[PDB]
Ligand binder design. Structure first.
Ligand SMILES: *[C@@H]1O[C@H](CO)[C@@H](O)[C@H](O)[C@H]1NC(C)=O
Lengths: 49, 49
């Protein structure tokens, strides 16, 4: 604990909440956007890819 | 965690940033501040990040 500021923060009531979307989910979103762009251009932004 | 009281009175409880093994179970009413008890082992237990 002594060599970590996070433990002192926690012990004094200051905590960090995790994001709702994980990094894996965000990477899935970006890969879907990339696949749409390189396979269908701008059509998937306006309707069906 | 609740749906509306207009839907149900059932709730779930999230103990934030703790392991399910270290979840406070206190048979005595003077060794824990929340006085209500939701049976950890009895009810459904899931461990999220
Ligand atoms: C909860 O504790 C057990 C035993 O100490 C450990 O193996 C497990 O990894 C802990 N939970 C998480 C989510 O790390």
């Amino acid at each position: 604990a002594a060599r970590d500021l996070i433990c002192a923060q926690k012990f004094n009531g200051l905590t960090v909440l995790p994001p709702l979307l994980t990094d894996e989910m965000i990477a899935q979103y970006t890969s879907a956007l990339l696949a749409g762009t390189i396979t269908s251009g701008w059509t998937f932004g306006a309707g069906a890819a | 965690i609740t749906p509306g009281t207009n839907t149900s009175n059932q709730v779930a409880v999230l103990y934030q940033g703790v392991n399910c093994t270290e979840v406070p179970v206190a048979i005595h009413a003077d060794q824990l501040t929340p006085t209500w008890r939701v049976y950890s082992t009895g009810s459904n237990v899931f461990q999220t990040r």
